[PDB]
Design a binder for this molecule. Structure first.
Ligand SMILES: Nc1ncnc2c1ncn2[C@@H]1O[C@H](COP(=O)(O)OP(=O)(O)OP(=O)(O)O)[C@@H](O)[C@H]1O
Ligand SMILES: Nc1ncnc2c1ncn2[C@@H]1O[C@H](COP(=O)(O)OP(=O)(O)OP(=O)(O)O)[C@@H](O)[C@H]1O
Ligand SMILES: Nc1ncnc2c1ncn2[C@@H]1O[C@H](COP(=O)(O)OP(=O)(O)OP(=O)(O)O)[C@@H](O)[C@H]1O
Ligand SMILES: [Mg+2]
Ligand SMILES: [Mg+2]
Ligand SMILES: [Mg+2]
Ligand SMILES: [Mg+2]
Ligand SMILES: [Mg+2]
Ligand SMILES: [Mg+2]
Lengths: 506, 148, 74, 59
């Protein structure tokens, strides 16, 4: 690798990508942020991983939390630091003050501490070091100039010792100064910043690397979530555009469509089904999920508009029994309110569920559901995610989008996702003679030929029926057409009189 | 209750922000959905006739069945019309019907078959030679059948 | 935050009443509502016919239209 | 016909029945003199109508 600085791997999901390799060895990285931002996890997890994958003993210095507590809490994710401290792979060094204290002690203790840390590392032969909340230390009675000097010292002794440290820090404002005294930002070799942006009642955590003295890295805020597995970052910008593309075909659950689609969807393609509310995008998906199961494949359905219960009533009324689909262990339905989490979260829940089940087909009913309230740039960035994942994983996708205005929609999507998708299947209402009739159209397919006809289709108990187009109609997209006739009566099967039978016999 | 009805969610979305509304809706919606309570919600589109969207607040998606009322300008007169726009479990009629209101109530008559652009409120009457073909004078091929 | 465990992130609206604090996790409620194949009238028989037999007992019904159209009646 | 003529209408009456027609109406030293509707026009509401003058049934 072409980077003048040799980095060490955190093994935290994706941080390495963002940092183009992980922390620089022999240096210190200031990880700062407000309260509940992830600081202590990051630090802990940074030592942990060096222990479980590289047998790199680590020293963990705490100034506020108790040594008992860092262990107690650490179990939350499923790590037994206890045992590690037992095998001497992890030394916890307690520097918290006492419940029955005095006043004054932060300079010769900084010297005593350095001399302390040197020891632990020497004794445990450690290669990784964390220092949690150095901030709280000068929080006895100090000012800017005294901190800079006292930090500098610690950091410098650490680098001479050759340790790859990590210092955590607090801030007050999410976007103001980086640290408290506004001096940590310039004495560290690297600065990693954690945020927990409020914004509209929800809460979004991001991780940013402001600087790495010596190398490139990924500029800007990147979303991440804390789970039962620790931190987890999504390099929504590091995701390269090198997904595989084949010419294979897969049914749509509906034959006629397939025809219309040059011969059934592409295995490797993102499918977009737009249309007014009530047009039957939901239906189509149901058939698309079904068909994978009828052929013995796995597919997940993520519904953000209908309950798992209702999703079944309607699914049965349209034939196709989803109950069995759940049983034969082929179809898996999710169901989740978009308001029950942010985009960073939903994105992961989906991914995860995509791993624990290895679908071959995936269908997210109503992306425009996920668009509720979110900023377009945040939504577009979500779409790109799920979409991308699905592409680079050979998993066909069927996404749904509902247009804010029935009939008269001058655009495929109000979020302009248009160009992200590969194929588009359109649905709309047609005011034909005091009646609302459905019409289906295959607007675009990237690799195929697809029919260029706006066929009328009726919904039944059996499901979708794809008839023919309103040839003798102008202003079809207008929703409310106009009927011009150069013919109509023309052949097709004229011959009058008694052409039919009735229920008795024919 | 076994049935609940809210007259004008459109009343509640006065002033209050959108996201805060959609939240209220989901609220009074799901509680009624899990508690086994059928509910009828009322929305008044800010603009009579020509309304291009079911609801200004975009709730239409969080609902099971949509019933739509809309004025229709017919011969200098403002008449009503109703349509079961959508229903998730059922079949439902696709005809945009007319309807009068009296002392008895709502009488749903017929659909406007001889018209165009009904949804826009100001339709275009368009009979000018109803479906019997220009052969209303049936050409004159039928001049041989009857005789002496 | 809750050092050590998980929780729900974000603000949540609650109301101080005669029964103290009442918080509505409008994001915690789950999408597990019960759904049946039952029908119910509306008060308009014809409407019942158009809808396909009647509104389902388990559902939400919306009534839109300009001012004066007659939703309040329905 | 290139003239700005008025029209009145009871859009909605909550209790009563009220007339549904869009009636022409002029103004003079006597006050409002409501006339007849535009029975033979289309799109009145829009403001710029369109007389129908339908060729009846054309025999
Ligand atoms: N198992 C878990 N699953 C999901 N979230 C968790 C889990 N454990 C902890 N959290 C969350 O992680 C956060 C813990 O933050 P952490 O202890 O890492 O450091 P901090 O908040 O940056 O700094 P400080 O120790 O001063 O609070 C909490 O806000 C909590 O909501
Ligand atoms: N058994 C059925 N028989 C005939 N038509 C049906 C049947 N079930 C549903 N429909 C029709 O399909 C519509 C239901 O829409 P569907 O569930 O397919 O998804 P959608 O219209 O794309 O999106 P959404 O349901 O969120 O509005 C109804 O409005 C209705 O006209
Ligand atoms: N007794 C009646 N006889 C004939 N028509 C009536 C009678 N009562 C009301 N109407 C008609 O019905 C309309 C009343 O509308 P309705 O009470 O159904 O509620 P809405 O349009 O949904 O809301 P809002 O009452 O605020 O306008 C009137 O505009 C009127 O034309
Ligand atoms: Mg904190
Ligand atoms: Mg901490
Ligand atoms: Mg739906
Ligand atoms: Mg919908
Ligand atoms: Mg009203
Ligand atoms: Mg009212």
């Amino acid at each position: 690798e072409h980077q003048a600085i040799a980095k060490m791997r955190t093994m935290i999901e994706g941080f390495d990508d963002i940092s183009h390799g992980g922390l620089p060895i022999g240096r210190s990285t200031l990880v700062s942020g407000t309260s509940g931002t992830g600081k202590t996890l990051f630090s802990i997890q940074f030592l942990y991983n060096g222990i479980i994958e590289f047998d790199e003993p680590g020293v963990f210095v705490t100034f506020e939390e108790t040594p008992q507590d860092i262990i107690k809490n650490a179990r939350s994710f499923g790590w037994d630091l206890a045992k590690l401290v037992d095998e001497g792979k992890l030394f916890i060094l307690d520097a918290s003050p006492d419940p029955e204290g005095q006043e004054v002690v932060g300079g010769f203790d900084l010297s005593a501490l350095i001399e302390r840390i040197n020891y632990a590392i020497q004794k445990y032969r450690a290669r990784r070091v964390s220092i949690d909340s150095v901030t709280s230390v000068f929080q006895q009675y100090d000012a800017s100039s005294v901190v800079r000097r006292e930090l500098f010292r610690l950091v410098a002794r650490l680098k001479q010792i050759g340790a790859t440290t990590v210092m955590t820090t607090e801030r007050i404002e999410e976007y103001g100064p980086i640290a408290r005294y506004g001096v940590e930002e310039f004495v560290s070799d690297n600065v990693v910043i954690l945020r927990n942006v409020l914004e509209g009642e929800r809460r979004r955590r991001t991780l940013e690397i402001l600087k790495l003295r010596g190398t490139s890295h990924m500029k800007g805020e990147y979303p991440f979530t804390i789970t039962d597995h620790g931190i987890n970052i999504f390099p929504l910008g590091a995701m390269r555009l090198t997904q595989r593309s084949s010419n294979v075909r897969v049914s749509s659950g509906v034959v006629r469509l397939d025809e219309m689609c040059g011969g059934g969807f592409f295995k490797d393609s993102i499918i977009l089904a737009t249309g007014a509310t009530g047009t039957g995008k939901t239906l189509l998906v149901s058939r698309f999920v079904e068909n994978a199961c009828a052929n013995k494949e796995r597919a997940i359905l993520f519904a953000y508009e209908e309950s798992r219960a209702q999703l079944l009533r309607n699914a049965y009324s349209w034939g196709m029994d989803f109950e069995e689909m759940e049983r034969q262990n082929l179809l898996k339905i999710v169901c989740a309110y978009p308001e029950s989490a942010g985009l960073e979260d939903h994105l992961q829940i989906i991914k995860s569920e995509i791993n624990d089940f290895k679908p071959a087909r995936i269908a997210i009913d109503s992306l425009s559901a996920l668009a509720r309230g979110v900023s377009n740039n945040a939504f577009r960035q979500f779409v790109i995610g799920v979409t991308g994942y699905a592409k680079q994983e050979e998993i066909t996708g069927l996404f749904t989008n509902t247009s804010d205005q029935f009939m008269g929609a001058h655009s495929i999507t109000d979020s302009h996702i248009d160009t992200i998708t590969d194929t588009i299947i359109l649905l709309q209402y047609v005011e034909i003679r005091g009646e609302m009739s459905r019409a289906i159209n295959v607007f675009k397919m990237r690799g195929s030929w697809h029919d260029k006809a706006i066929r009328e289709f009726m919904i039944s108990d059996k499901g979708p029926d794809i008839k023919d187009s309103f040839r003798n109609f102008e202003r079809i997209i207008s929703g409310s057409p106009t009927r011009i006739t150069v013919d109509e009566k023309s052949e097709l099967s004229r011959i009058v009189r008694g052409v039919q039978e009735k229920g008795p016999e024919s």
